[PDB]
Coordinates of C-alpha atoms and ligand atoms in Angstrom, one line a residue:
X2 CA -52.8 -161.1 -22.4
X3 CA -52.7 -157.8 -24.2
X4 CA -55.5 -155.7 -25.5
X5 CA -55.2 -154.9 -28.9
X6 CA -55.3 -150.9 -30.1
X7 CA -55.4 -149.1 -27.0
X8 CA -52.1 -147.3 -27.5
X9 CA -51.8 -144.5 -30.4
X10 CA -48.6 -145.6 -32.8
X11 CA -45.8 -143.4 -31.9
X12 CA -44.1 -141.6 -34.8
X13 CA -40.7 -141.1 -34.1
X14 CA -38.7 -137.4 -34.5
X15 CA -36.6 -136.7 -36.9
X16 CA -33.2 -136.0 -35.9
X17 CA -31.6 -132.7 -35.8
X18 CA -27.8 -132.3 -36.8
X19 CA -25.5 -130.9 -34.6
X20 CA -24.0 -129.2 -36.9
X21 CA -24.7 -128.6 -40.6
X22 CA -23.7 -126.8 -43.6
X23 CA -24.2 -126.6 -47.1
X24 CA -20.8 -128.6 -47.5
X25 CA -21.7 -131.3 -44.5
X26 CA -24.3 -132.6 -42.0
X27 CA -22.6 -134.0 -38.9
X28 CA -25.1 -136.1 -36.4
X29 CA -24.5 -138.2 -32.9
X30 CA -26.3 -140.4 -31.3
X31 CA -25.5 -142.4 -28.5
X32 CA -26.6 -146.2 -27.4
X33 CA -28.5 -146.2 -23.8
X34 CA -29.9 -147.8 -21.5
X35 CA -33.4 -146.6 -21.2
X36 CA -37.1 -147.1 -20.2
X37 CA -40.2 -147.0 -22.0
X38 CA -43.7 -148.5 -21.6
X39 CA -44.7 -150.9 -24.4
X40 CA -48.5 -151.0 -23.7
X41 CA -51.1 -148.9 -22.0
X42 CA -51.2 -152.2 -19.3
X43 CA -47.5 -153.1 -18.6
X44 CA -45.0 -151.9 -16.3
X45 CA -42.3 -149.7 -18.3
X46 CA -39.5 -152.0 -19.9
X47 CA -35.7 -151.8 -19.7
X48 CA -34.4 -151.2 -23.1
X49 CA -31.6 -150.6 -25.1
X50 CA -32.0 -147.5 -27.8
X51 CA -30.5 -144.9 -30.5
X52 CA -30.3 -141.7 -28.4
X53 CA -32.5 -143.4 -25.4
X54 CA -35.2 -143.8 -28.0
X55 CA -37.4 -147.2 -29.2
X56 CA -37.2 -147.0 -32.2
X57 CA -34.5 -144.5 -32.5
X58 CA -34.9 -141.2 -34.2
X59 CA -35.2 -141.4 -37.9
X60 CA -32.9 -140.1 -40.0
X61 CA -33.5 -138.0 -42.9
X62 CA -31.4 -137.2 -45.8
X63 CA -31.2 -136.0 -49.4
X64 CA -29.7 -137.5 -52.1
X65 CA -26.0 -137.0 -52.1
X66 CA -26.5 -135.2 -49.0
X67 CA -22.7 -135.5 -47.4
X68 CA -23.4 -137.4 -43.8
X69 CA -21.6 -138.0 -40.4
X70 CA -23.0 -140.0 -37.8
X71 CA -20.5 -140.6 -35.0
X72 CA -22.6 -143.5 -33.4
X73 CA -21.0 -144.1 -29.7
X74 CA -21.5 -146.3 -27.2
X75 CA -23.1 -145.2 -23.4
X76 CA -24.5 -149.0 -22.4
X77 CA -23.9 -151.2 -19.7
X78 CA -20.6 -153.7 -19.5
X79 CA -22.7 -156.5 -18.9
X80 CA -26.0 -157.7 -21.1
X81 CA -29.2 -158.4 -20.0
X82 CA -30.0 -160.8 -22.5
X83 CA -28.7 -164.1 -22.8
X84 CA -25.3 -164.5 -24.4
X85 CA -24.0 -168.0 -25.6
X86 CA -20.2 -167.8 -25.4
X87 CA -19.8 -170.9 -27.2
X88 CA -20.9 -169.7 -30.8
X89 CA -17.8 -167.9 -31.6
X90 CA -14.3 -168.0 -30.4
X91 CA -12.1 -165.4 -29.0
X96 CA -9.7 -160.6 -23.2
X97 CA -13.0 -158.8 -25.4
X98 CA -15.8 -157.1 -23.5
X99 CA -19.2 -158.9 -23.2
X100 CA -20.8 -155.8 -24.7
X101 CA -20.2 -154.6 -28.5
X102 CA -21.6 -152.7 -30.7
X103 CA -21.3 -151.3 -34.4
X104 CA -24.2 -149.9 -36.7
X105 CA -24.9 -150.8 -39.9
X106 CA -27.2 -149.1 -42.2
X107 CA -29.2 -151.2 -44.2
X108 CA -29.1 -150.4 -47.7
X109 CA -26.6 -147.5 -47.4
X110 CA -24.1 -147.5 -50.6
X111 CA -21.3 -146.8 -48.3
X112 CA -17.7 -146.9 -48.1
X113 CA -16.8 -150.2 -45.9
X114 CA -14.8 -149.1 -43.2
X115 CA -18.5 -147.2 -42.2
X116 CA -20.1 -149.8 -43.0
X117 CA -20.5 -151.3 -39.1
X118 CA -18.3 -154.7 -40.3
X119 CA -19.4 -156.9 -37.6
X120 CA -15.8 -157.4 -36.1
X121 CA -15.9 -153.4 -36.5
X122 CA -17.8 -153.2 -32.9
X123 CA -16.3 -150.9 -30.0
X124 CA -17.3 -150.9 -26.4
X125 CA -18.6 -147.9 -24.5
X126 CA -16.6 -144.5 -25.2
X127 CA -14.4 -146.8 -27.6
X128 CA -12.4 -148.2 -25.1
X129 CA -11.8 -151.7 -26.9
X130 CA -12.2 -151.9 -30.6
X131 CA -12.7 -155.1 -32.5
X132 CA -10.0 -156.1 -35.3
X133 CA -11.2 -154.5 -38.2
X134 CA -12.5 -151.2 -36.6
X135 CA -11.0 -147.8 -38.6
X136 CA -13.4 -144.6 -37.3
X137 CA -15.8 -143.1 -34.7
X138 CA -17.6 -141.4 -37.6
X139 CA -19.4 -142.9 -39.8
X140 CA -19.3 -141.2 -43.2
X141 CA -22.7 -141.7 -45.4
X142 CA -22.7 -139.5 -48.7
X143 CA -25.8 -140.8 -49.8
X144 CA -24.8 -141.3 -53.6
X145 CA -27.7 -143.4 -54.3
X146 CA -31.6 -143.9 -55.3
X147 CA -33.9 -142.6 -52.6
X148 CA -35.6 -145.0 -50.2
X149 CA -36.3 -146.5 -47.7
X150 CA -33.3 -147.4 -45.1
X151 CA -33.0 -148.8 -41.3
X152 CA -30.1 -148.9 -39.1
X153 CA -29.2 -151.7 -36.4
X154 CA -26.5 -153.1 -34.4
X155 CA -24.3 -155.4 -36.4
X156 CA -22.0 -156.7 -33.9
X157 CA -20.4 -160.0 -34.6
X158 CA -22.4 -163.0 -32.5
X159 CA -24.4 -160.1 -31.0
X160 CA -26.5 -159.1 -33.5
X161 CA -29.9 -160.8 -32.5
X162 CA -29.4 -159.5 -28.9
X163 CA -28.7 -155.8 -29.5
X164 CA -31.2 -155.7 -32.1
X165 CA -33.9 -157.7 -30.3
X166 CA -32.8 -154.8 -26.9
X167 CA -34.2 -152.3 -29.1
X168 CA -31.2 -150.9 -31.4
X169 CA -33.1 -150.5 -34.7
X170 CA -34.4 -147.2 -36.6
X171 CA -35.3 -145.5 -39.7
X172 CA -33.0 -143.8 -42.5
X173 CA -34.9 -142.0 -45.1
X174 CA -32.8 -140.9 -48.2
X175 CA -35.0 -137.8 -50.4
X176 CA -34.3 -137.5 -54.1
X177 CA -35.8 -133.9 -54.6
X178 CA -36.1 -135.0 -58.6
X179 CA -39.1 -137.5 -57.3
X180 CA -40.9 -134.3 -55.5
X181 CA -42.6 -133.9 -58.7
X182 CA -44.7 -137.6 -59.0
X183 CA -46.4 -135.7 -56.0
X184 CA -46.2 -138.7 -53.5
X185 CA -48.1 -138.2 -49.9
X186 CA -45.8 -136.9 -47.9
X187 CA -44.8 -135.4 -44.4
X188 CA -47.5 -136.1 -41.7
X189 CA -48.5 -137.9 -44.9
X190 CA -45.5 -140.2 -45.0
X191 CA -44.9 -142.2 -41.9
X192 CA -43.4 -145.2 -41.3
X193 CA -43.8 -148.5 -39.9
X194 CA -41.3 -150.7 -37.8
X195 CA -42.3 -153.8 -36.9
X196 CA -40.8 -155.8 -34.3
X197 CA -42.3 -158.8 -32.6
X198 CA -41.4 -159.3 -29.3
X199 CA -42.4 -161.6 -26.0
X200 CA -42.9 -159.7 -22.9
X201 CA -42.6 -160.8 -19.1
X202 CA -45.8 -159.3 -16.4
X203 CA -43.1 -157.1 -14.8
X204 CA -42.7 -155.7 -18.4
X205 CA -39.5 -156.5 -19.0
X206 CA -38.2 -158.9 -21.9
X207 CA -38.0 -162.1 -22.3
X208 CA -35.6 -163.8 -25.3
X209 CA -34.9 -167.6 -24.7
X210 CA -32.1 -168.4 -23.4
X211 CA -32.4 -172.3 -25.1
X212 CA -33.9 -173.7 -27.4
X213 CA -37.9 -175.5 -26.7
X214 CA -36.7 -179.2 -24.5
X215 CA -33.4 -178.1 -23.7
X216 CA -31.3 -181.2 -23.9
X217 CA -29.3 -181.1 -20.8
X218 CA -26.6 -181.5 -23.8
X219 CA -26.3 -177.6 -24.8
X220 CA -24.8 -174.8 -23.2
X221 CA -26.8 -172.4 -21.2
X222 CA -27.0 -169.8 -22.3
X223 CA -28.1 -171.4 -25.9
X224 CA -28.3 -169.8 -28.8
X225 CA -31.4 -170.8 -30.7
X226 CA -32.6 -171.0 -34.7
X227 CA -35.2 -168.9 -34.4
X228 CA -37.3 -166.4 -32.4
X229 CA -41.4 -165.7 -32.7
X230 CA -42.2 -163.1 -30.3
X231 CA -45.9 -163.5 -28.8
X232 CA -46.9 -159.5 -30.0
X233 CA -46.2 -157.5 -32.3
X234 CA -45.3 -153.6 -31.8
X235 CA -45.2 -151.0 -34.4
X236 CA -43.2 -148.2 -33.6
X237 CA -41.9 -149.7 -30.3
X238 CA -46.2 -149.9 -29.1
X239 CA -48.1 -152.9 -28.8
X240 CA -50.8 -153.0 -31.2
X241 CA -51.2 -150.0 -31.9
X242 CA -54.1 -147.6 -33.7
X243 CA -53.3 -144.7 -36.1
X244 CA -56.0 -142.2 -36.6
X245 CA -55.4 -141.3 -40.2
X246 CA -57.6 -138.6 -42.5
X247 CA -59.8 -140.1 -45.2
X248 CA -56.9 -139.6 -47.8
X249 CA -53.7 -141.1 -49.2
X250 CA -50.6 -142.2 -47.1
X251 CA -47.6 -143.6 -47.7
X252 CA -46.0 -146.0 -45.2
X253 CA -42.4 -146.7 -44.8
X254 CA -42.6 -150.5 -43.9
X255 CA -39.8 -152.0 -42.3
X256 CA -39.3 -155.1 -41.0
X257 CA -37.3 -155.1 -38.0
X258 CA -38.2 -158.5 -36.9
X259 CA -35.5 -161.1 -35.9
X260 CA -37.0 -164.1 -37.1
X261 CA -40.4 -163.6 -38.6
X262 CA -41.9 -163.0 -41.8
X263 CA -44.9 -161.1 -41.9
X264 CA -48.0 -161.3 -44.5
X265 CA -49.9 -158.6 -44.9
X266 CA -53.5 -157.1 -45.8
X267 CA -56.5 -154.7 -44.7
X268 CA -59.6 -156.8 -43.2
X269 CA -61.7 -155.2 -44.8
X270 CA -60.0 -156.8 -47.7
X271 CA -58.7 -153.2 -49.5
X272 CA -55.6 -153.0 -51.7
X273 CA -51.9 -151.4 -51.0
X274 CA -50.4 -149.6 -54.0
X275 CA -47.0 -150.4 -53.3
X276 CA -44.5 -147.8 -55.2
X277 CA -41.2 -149.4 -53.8
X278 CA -38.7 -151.6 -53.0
X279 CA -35.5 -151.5 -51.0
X280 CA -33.8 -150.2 -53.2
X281 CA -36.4 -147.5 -54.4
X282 CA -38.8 -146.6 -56.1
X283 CA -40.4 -149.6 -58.6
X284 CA -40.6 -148.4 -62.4
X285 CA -44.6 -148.7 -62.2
X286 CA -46.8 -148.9 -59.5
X287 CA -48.2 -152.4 -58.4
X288 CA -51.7 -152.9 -56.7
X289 CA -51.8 -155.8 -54.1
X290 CA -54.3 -156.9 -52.2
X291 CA -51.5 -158.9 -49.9
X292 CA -47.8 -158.9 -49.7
X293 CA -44.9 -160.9 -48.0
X294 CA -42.3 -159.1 -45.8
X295 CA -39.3 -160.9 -44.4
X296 CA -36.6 -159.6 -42.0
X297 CA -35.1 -156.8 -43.2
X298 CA -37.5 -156.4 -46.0
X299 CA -38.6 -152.8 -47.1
X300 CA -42.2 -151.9 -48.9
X301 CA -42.3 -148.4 -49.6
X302 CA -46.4 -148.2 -50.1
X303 CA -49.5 -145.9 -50.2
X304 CA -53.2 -146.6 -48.6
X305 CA -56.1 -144.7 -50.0
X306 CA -58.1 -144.2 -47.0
X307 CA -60.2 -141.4 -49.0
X308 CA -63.6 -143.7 -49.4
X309 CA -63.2 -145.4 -45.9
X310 CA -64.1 -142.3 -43.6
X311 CA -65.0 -143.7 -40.2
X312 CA -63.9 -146.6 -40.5
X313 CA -61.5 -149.0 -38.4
X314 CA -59.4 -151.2 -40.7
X315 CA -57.2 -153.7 -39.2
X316 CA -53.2 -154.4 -40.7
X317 CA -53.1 -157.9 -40.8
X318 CA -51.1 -161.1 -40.9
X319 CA -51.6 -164.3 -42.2
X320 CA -48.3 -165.5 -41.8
X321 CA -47.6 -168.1 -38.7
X322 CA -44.6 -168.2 -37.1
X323 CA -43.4 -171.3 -35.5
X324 CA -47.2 -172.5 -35.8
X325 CA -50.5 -171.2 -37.2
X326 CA -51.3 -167.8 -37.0
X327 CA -53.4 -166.8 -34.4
X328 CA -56.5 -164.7 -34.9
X329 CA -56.7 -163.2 -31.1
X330 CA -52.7 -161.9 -30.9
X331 CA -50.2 -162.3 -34.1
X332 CA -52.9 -162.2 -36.8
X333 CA -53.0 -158.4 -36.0
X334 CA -50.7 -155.6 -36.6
X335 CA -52.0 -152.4 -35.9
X336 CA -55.5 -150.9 -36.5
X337 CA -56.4 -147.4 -39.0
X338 CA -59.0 -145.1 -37.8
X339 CA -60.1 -143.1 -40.5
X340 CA -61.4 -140.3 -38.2
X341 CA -59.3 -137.6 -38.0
X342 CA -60.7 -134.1 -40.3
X343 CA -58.5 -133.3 -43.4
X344 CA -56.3 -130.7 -42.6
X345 CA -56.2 -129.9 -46.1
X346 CA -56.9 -130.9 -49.6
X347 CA -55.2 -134.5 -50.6
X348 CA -53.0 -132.9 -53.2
X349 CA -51.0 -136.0 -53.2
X350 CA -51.3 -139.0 -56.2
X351 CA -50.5 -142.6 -56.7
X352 CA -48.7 -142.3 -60.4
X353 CA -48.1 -145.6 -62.5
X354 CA -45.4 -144.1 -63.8
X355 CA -42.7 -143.8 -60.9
X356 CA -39.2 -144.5 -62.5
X357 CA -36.5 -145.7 -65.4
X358 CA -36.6 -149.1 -66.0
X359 CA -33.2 -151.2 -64.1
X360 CA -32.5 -152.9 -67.6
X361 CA -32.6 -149.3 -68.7
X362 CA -28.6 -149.9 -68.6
X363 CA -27.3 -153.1 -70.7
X364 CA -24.6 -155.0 -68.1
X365 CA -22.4 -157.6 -68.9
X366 CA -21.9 -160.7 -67.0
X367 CA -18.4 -161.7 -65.5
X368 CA -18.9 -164.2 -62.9
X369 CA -21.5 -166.6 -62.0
X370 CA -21.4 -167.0 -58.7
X371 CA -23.0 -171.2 -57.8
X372 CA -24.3 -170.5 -53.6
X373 CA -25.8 -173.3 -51.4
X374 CA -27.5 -172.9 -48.1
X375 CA -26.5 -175.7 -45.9
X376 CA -25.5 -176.5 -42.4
X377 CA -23.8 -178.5 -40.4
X378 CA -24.2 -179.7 -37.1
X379 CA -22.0 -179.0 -33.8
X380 CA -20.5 -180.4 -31.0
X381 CA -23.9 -180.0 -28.6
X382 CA -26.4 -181.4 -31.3
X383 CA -27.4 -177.8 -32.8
X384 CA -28.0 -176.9 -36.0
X385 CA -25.4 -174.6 -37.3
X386 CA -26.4 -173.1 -40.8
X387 CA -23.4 -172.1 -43.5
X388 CA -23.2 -170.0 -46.5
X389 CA -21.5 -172.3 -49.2
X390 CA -19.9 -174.6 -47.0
X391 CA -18.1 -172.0 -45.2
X392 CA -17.7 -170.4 -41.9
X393 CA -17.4 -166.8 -41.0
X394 CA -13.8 -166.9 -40.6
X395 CA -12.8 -168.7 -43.1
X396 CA -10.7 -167.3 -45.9
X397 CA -12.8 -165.0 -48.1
X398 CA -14.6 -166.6 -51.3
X399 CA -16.9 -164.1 -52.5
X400 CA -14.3 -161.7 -54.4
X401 CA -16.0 -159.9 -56.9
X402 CA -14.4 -156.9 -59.2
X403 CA -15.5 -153.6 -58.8
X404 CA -17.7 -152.2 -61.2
X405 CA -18.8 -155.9 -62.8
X406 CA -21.8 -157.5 -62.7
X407 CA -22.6 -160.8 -61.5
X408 CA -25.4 -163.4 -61.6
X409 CA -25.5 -165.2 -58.1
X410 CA -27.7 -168.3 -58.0
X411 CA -28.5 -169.0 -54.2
X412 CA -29.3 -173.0 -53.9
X413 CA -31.8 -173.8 -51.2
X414 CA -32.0 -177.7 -50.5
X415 CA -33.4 -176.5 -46.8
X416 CA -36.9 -177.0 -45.7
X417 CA -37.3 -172.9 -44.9
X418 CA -37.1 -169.7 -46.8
X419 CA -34.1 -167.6 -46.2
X420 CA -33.8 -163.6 -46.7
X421 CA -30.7 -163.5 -48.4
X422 CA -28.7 -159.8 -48.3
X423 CA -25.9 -158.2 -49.4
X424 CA -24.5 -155.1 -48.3
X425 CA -23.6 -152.0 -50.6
X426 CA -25.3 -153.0 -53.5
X427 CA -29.3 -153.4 -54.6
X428 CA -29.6 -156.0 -57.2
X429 CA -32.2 -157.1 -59.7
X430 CA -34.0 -160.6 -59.5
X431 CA -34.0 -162.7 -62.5
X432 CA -35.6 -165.8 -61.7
X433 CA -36.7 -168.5 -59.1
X434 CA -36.8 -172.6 -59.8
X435 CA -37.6 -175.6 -58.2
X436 CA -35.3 -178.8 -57.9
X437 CA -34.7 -182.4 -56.9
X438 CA -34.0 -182.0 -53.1
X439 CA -33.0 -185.5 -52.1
X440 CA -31.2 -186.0 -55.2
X441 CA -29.4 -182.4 -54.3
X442 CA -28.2 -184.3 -51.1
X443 CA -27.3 -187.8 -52.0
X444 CA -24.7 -186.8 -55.2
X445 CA -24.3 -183.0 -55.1
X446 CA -26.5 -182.8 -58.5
X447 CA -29.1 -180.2 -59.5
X448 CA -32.1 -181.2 -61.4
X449 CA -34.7 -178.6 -61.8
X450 CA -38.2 -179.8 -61.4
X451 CA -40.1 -177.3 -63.4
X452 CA -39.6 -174.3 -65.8
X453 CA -37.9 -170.9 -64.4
X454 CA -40.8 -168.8 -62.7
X455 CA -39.6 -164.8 -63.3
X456 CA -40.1 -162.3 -60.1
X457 CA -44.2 -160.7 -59.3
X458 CA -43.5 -157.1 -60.5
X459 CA -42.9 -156.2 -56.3
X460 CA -39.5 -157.9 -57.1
X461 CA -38.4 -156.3 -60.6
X462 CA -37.0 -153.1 -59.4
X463 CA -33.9 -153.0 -56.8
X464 CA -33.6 -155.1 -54.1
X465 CA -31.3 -155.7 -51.4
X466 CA -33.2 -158.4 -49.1
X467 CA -34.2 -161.1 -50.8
X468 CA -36.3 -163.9 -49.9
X469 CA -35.2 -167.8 -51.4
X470 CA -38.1 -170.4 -51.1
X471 CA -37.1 -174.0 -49.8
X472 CA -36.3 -176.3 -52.4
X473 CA -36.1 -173.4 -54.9
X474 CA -32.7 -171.5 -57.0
X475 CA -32.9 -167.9 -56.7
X476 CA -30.9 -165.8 -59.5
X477 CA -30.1 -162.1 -58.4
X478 CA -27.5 -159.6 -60.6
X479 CA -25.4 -157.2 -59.1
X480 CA -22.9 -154.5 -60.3
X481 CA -20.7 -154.3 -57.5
X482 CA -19.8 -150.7 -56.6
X483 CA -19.2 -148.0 -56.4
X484 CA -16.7 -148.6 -53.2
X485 CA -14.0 -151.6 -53.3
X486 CA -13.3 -153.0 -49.8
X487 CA -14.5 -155.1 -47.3
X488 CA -18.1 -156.0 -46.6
X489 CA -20.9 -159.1 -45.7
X490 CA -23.7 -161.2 -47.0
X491 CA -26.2 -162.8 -45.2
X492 CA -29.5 -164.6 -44.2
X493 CA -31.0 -161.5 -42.6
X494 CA -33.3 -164.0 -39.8
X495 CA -30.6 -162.8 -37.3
X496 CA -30.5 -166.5 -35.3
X497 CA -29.2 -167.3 -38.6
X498 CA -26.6 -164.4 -38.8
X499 CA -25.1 -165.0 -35.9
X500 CA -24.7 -168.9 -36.2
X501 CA -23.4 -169.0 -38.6
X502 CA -24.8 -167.7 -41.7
X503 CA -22.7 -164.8 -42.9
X504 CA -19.3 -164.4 -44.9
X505 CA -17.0 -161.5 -45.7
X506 CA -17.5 -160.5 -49.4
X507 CA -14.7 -158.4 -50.7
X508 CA -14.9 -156.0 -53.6
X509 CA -11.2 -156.0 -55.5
X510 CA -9.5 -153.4 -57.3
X511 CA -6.6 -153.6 -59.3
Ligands
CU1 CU1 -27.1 -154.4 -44.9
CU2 CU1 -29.6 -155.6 -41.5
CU3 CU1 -31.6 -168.1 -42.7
CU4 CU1 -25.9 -157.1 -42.6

């Protein structure tokens, strides 16, 4: 296998419009097949990417900056991954795709619904498709933002093919707290993927002992990848100058959750969240990252000239974590000269407070995590009882607030999201599991524990423990329409852990 840090991190280009005025900034970019080598010793792989790109270009914006995207389709009519038919029932092409970006306050017929997917040049259109271009005005806090394919029963596939990137929204009022920025500014997509000896890539296409029971193709209930790649490289190194950075840290992981720290046991400042920037800055010496996570953060490199210090991960998947492969990340090199002074800083002051604004509550919305079991044995996990296409239950008012207290009797965490809005956390709690199951009652087990200050700004990703409640509040807004929530491990997504959420007006 593999040798570690051999391969400089790519950095993805920015994107350049194809058109753009003062009034609008109007992008494509087109899903394609393409190739690109994943490690100085493998054969090229066959992959699926944003503009022929892995990752695809990031995308930079301002702060109400008016954007288009018209995000078409140029890939293959048949997969090269394995697709169970079974999981969802419809003739509709094997291929679709729709993109969603993560975090983007956007109006819902652009948000990339997941029975909004088209086939290549638009030729078939799923049910609640409305537009080729995406419209993305960018009326929110800056921060950090990725976009992916959010195809209905697809989504692990196309994403795990290679269909992720970076959105970056600029608020030119935070220019002034003097943040590191460009070269300085550079962010991290993490992906963990398993890889065949002719390069190409390898997803399971059932589950560890198939039982001659399931389908084949089977879907499975989650997905550990043997490396890890930042930036679409294999363990890669960065040469950085001894100075501050901030990283953009996305995870863009299917399954995984990643824990993070420097082995030379250094601290992060991280200065935000998905949803922006924290109030204060927060020094950690560790943090937890699950999928679709964001940690907007800085690393002072300025006292660690020469030095090699490795990103890395305590976290196992599926098993211990192993020192020789998934234990590591990526690897700084603190060798290259300053091109000029660090004028950059690392502020405790960042922003206004969220409870800057007094809400009041109209709905308490009660959640469990829970899952059935199907037809071939499988495990098949529901929001609340309810399936995908059942009749919409989650119908808040626009421009209310609600508290939403996610119930997990499971034995796993679960990265709950919601699309269009960030939220605050209030609390987390621990209850009376079996007693959960037998009657239906909840009995808490200890007092109400309130969020480590990484969790008290906005959030949109949200990570609930096993045997835990998790309390979030949301104003739902600014849009009305029709969008999703879900557990954002995407063998979850798809199977069948996401349900419509619908934003009234009257
Ligand atoms: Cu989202
Ligand atoms: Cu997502
Ligand atoms: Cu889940
Ligand atoms: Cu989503």
């Amino acid at each position: 296998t593999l040798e570690k840090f051999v391969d400089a991190l790519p950095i993805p280009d920015t994107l350049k419009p194809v058109q753009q005025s003062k009034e609008k900034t109007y992008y494509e970019v087109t899903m394609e097949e393409c190739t690109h080598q994943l490690h100085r010793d493998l054969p090229p792989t066959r992959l699926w990417g944003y503009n022929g790109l892995f990752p695809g270009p990031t995308i930079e914006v301002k702060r109400n900056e008016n954007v288009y995207v018209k995000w078409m389709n140029n890939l293959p009519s048949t997969h090269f991954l394995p697709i169970d038919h079974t999981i969802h029932h419809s003739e509709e092409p094997e291929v679709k795709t729709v993109v969603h970006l993560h975090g983007g306050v956007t109006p819902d017929d652009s948000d990339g619904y997941p029975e909004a997917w088209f086939s290549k040049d638009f030729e078939q259109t799923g049910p609640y498709f409305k537009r080729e271009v995406y419209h993305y005005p960018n009326q929110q806090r800056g921060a950090i933002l990725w976009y992916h394919d959010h195809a209905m029963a697809l989504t692990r596939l196309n994403v795990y093919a290679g269909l992720v990137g970076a959105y970056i929204i600029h608020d030119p009022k935070e220019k002034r707290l003097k943040l590191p920025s460009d070269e300085y500014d550079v962010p991290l997509l993490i992906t963990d993927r398993t890889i065949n000896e002719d390069g190409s890539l390898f997803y399971p296409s059932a589950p560890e002992n198939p039982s001659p029971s399931l389908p084949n193709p089977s879907i499975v209930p989650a997905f550990c990848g043997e490396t890890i790649l930042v930036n679409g490289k294999v363990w890669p190194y960065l040469e950085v100058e001894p100075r501050k950075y901030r990283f953009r840290v996305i995870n863009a992981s299917n399954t995984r959750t990643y824990n993070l720290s420097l082995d030379n046991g250094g601290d992060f400042i991280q200065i935000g969240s998905d949803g922006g920037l924290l109030p204060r800055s927060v020094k950690l010496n560790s943090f937890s990252l699950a999928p679709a996570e964001r940690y907007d953060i800085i690393i002072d490199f300025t006292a660690y000239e020469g030095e090699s210090i490795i990103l890395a991960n305590s976290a196992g998947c599926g098993g211990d974590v192993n020192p020789e492969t998934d234990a590591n990340i990526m690897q700084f090199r603190v060798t290259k000269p300053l091109a000029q002074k660090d004028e950059s800083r690392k502020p405790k002051y960042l922003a206004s407070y969220p409870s800057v604004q007094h809400e009041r509550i109209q709905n308490i919305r009660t959640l469990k995590l829970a899952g059935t079991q199907d037809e071939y044995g499988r495990p098949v996990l529901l929001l609340n009882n309810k399936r995908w296409h059942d009749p919409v239950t989650e119908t808040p008012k626009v421009g209310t607030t609600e508290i939403w207290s996610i119930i997990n009797p499971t034995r796993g965490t679960h990265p709950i999201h919601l699309h269009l809005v960030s939220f605050r956390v209030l609390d987390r709690r621990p209850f009376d599991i079996a007693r959960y199951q037998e009657s239906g009652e909840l009995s808490y087990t200890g007092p109400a524990v309130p969020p480590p200050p990484s969790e008290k700004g906005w959030k949109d990703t949200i990570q609930a423990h096993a045997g835990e409640v998790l309390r979030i509040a949301a104003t739902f807004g600014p849009y009305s329409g029709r969008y999703v929530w879900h557990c954002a491990i995407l063998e979850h997504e798809d199977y069948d852990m996401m349900r419509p959420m619908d934003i009234t007006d009257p």
